[PDB]
Each structure stands twice: as structure tokens, then as C-alpha cells.
Amino acid sequence: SPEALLKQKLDMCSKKGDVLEALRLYDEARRNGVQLSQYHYNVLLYVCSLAEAATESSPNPGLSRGFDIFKQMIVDKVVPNEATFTNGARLAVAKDDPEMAFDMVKQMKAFGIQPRLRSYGPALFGFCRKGDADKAYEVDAHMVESEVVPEEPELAALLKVSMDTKNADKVYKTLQRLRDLVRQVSKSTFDMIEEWFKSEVATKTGVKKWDVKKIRDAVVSGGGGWHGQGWLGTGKWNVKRTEMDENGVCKCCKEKLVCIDINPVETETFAASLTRLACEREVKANFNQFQEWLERHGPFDAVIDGANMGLVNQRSFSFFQLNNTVQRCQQISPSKRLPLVILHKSRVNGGPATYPKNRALLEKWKNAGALYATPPGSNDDWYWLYAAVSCKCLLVTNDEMRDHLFQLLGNSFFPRWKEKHQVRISVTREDGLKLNMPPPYSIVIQESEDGTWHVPMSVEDDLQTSRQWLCAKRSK
Ligand SMILES: NCCCCCC(=O)O
Numbered sequence: 001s002p003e004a005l006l007k008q009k010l011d012m013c014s015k016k017g018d019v020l021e022a023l024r025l026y027d028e029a030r031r032n033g034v035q036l037s038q039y040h041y042n043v044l045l046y047v048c049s050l051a052e053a054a055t056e057s058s059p060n061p062g063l064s065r066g067f068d069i070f071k072q073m074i075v076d077k078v079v080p081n082e083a084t085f086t087n088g089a090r091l092a093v094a095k096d097d098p099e100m101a102f103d104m105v106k107q108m109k110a111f112g113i114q115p116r117l118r119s120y121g122p123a124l125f126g127f128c129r130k131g132d133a134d135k136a137y138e139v140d141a142h143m144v145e146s147e148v149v150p151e152e153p154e155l156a157a158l159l160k161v162s163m164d165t166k167n168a169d170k171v172y173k174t175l176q177r178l179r180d181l182v183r184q185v186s187k188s189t190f191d192m193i194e195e196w197f198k199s200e201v202a203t204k205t206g207v208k209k210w211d212v213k214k215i216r217d218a219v220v221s222g223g224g225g226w227h228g229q230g231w232l233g234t235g236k237w238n239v240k241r242t243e244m245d246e247n248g249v250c251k252c253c254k255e256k257l258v259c260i261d262i263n264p265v266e267t268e269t270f271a272a273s274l275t276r277l278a279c280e281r282e283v284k285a286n287f288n289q290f291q292e293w294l295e296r297h298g299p300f301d302a303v304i305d306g307a308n309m310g311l312v313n314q315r316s317f318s319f320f321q322l323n324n325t326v327q328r329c330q331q332i333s334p335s336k337r338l339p340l341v342i343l344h345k346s347r348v349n350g351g352p353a354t355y356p357k358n359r360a361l362l363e364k365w366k367n368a369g370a371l372y373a374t375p376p377g378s379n380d381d382w383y384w385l386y387a388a389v390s391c392k393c394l395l396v397t398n399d400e401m402r403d404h405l406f407q408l409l410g411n412s413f414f415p416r417w418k419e420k421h422q423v424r425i426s427v428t429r430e431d432g433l434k435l436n437m438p439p440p441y442s443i444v445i446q447e448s449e450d451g452t453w454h455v456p457m458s459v460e461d462d463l464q465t466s467r468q469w470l471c472a473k474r475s476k
């Protein structure tokens with residue numbers, strides 16, 4: 001078969017590195033009238049993205065023609081898959097021509113193809129490195145119009161280019177976007193925000209007086225913790241690295257941060273999403289069986305990730321640590337409810353249940369309506385997550401919750417829900433086990449009614465490392 005031969009020939013070069021031969025085969029396929037498929041086109045694109053940018057003369061044919069092949073694939077109405085956007089993008093990144101990267105995205109839109117976030121990157125970042133703010137905002141406007149949602153890298157780029165070109169409006173809007181989409185910022189973004197607030201442009205923006213009533217209503221309207229009506233106050237900013245105490249009180253300025261509400265409608269939307277995603281990966285009957293059991297049980301004040309509580313900081317499963325966590329959760333329940341323990345069926349049988357009194361207690365929890373053993377082969381993370389969300393209660397787990405399953409849940413609602421519901425254990429030599437409860441305020445960029453800002457840095461584990469904030473408040 002002709003296209004099967006081209007597949008095989010293109011699989012070979014390049015797993016060999018041979019761009020020249022891939023390009024020869026490309027032009028040959030056209031002279032023979034063999035129509036290239038999706039698979040062929042992807043291999044071509046990947047292979048061309050192995051070519052390098054000529055630090056000495058005219059661009060290399062592999063990069064130049066790489067774009068031309070991309071252009072052709074779309075013209076041919078050949079559907080792009082995830083490999084296409086990835087290869088298309090590394091092509092764009094290798095070339096490092098923001099204008100050409102932008103053309104690729106304009107072409108996808110032309111032909112009704114949804115561009116991906118990685119498609120926009122080389123265009124956005126290209127312009128940003130060259131200080132071309134206007135071009136950067138064009139790419140941004142295009143990305144927004146395509147309903148592609150930026151992440152922290154894209155926003156930090158936009159923030160930097162806005163700072164570089166003294167655009168206080170665009171700084172404000174980007175900072176709002178960071179609040180809305182990212183919440184807590186990386187070290188480098190944090191440093192950049194700090195620079196902004198200390199800068200001459202920031203000193204010189206603002207208003208001496210404003211419609212206090214309009215700010216009030218914007219606070220209500222936004223959900224709390226910001227107003228979005230623009231820079232307030234005048235003069236130099238006092239900008240300090242600081243911390244919040246356990247009550248959300250800024251140690252620098254004594255402002256008490258807001259606890260921002262979660263709309264219960266969003267929670268019901270998320271619960272439905274969860275069921276949909278779980279039933280796509282679990283045996284549907286196993287997940288449904290849990291849902292039905294949960295409907296006949298409760299109420300619960302807490303759900304325990306049993307495997308994580310048995311295992312976190314242990315060389316092997318500790319029934320002690322699970323049992324101590326169960327008792328501590330029951331003690332803080334106002335009515336002393338046992339928590340719902342989610343445990344693998346594999347973990348109820350064998351050991352920790354090696355010791356008969358432990359076995360008998362696990363069965364006691366099950367008979368009290370407070371243990372569900374997840375079937376062999378199931379991913380029990382769907383089960384304790386769905387239980388806590390559905391029962392509207394505390395979730396006791398030290399699971400990071402940023403491994404693949406959890407990337408599926410998104411970066412808007414889930415991180416806000418987690419902050420309000422997640423209980424983590426910590427253990428010391430001196431005191432034993434401690435429950436670390438959700439904070440009584442929201443750990444997010446906040447903008448006060450008088451225009452004062454508090455910006456949280458993102459950390460690995462805020463129990464391990466004490467979270468730094470920026471306090472930015474006008475001097476007079
Ligand atoms: N610290 C956790 C090690 C193994 C964890 C098992 C789990 O989290 O589901």
C-alpha cells in the first residue's frame with residue numbers, strides 16, 4: 001500500500017533524525033499523488049520541529065517548510081489531533097518568529113479549528129520578549145475570543161510587558177486576572193508584583209477620591225475580596241513582605257482578609273462533573289453502587305481518605321494512624337459522628353486487619369454506617385472526593401491532589417472548594433497527631449475597598465513552609 005509505505009518510511013526518518021529525507025518523501029508523495037493523512041502530517045511536523053534556527057544565515061528549510069506543511073494540512077481539511085498542536089507549537093517555538101506563530105493560530109480560526117493554549121504560547125511569549133505590547137495584547141484578545149483560558153505563565157508575560165511599557169491599566173487588569181484564575185502566585189510572579197507596586201508608574205497612578213458607594217456595590221457584585229474599579233488612593237506604596245496570622249490578619253497592616261463565599265450552584269455543577277468523570281473511568285456499576293449506598297447513609301461531618309491516612313509518612317500502612325485520625329475527627333464533630341472511612345477492599349482484608357481487634361473495629365465502623373470498602377481495580381480517589389462534595393463536609397486527606405485525575409477537575413472551582421473542605425494531618429514527636437483545619441479566610445489575591453492589596457505566594461505545602469504575602473498599602 002502506498003500510504004502504508006509512506007507511514008513506514010516516515011516512521012524511519014525520523015526516528016533517525018532525518019529531516020531532509022522526510023521533506024524529500026513529502027514532495028515525492030505529492031508527485032505520486034499519495035494524499036498525506038493525519039498520521040503522515042503529524043510525523044512530518046514533528047520531524048521538521050527537530051530543525052534549528054540559523055544563528056548565522058537564512059532560515060533552514062526544515063523550519064521554513066515546516067510551517068508550509070502545517071498550512072497545507074489545514075488546507076487539505078485533515079483534522080488536527082493533540083499531537084498536531086504539540087508539534088505545530090514546537091515548530092513555532094524552534095523558529096521563534098512570533099508573527100509566524102500568530103499566523104498559524106489565525107489560520108486555525110479561519111478553518112473552524114479550535115486553537116489550544118500551547119498554540120498561543122510561542123506567539124504571546126515571542127512578542128513579550130521583544131517588548132511588543134500591542135502585538136502581545138492582540139494575541140491575548142484573540143485567545144480570549146477563542147475562549148482559551150490563560151495560565152500563570154501567559155499572565156505573568158502580559159504583566160511584565162505591561163510594566164515595561166508603563167501601562168497601569170493593563171497592570172490592573174492582569175492582576176485581576178491573576179486573582180480570578182491563579183489565586184496564589186509563583187515566586188517569580190510575586191517578585192514582579194512587588195516591583196510593580198514599588199515602581200514610579202504605580203506611585204503616580206490612582207485617584208485622591210472616588211464614589212465610595214460604587215466601590216461598595218462592586219464588592220457585592222464580584223462575590224467578595226475585590227472590587228475591580230481601578231487603582232485607588234495616591235502617592236507612593238508601602239510594599240512589605242509579610243504573613244497572615246491564623247485568623248487572616250495581615251501582620252504588617254492589620255487588615256483582616258475576607259473569607260470568600262462559594263456559590264452552592266457552582267458546587268452542584270461540580271458534583272455532576274465529578275460523577276460524569278468518575279463514570280468515564282470507573283466501572284459504571286461500581287461507582288453507581290457507591291452513589292446508592294451513600295444516599296442511604298450519613299449524615300457525615302467528615303470523609304477520610306483511608307489509604308492516605310494509613311500511609312502518609314509511614315513505611316507501611318499504619319492502622320494506628322488511621323484509627324487515631326478517625327477518633328480525632330469524631331471528637332471534633334459537634335454531635336460525635338464517626339467520619340466516613342473510604343478504604344480499598346484490599347485494605348480491609350489481610351493487614352492492617354492482620355490483628356483481630358483491628359479487623360473487628362473496621363467491621364464495627366462498617367456496621368455503624370461509616371466505612372465503605374472500594375472494589376478491587378477501582379481508583380478510590382473518585383469515591384472520597386465524591387463523598388465529601390456530595391455530603392458537603394470536611395475531606396481528610398494529605399493527598400496533594402494535583403496528579404492526573406485531579407488535573408481533570410480544573411483550576412477554577414476545585415482549588416477554592418479544596419481550601420474550604422480539606423483537612424490535613426501533621427504529626428510531631430512531642431504532641432502526636434494534629435488536624436489542620438481549613439483557614440477562616442481565603443488564600444487569594446485580595447483588593448480592599450480602600451484599594452489596599454494582599455498577594456499570596458504559592459507554596460508546596462503551607463504546613464511545611466510559612467506562606468509569604470505581599471502587603472501593598474498607600475503611604476498617605
Ligand atoms: N504519602 C502517601 C504515600 C502513599 C499514599 C497513598 C494515597 O495517598 O492514596
Ligand SMILES: [Mn+2]
Pocket residue numbers: 305307308380381399
Ligand atoms: Mn488515593
Ligand SMILES: [Mn+2]
Pocket residue numbers: 381399403
Ligand atoms: Mn492519589
Ligand SMILES: [Zn+2]
Pocket residue numbers: 250251252253254255454471472473
Ligand atoms: Zn497588609
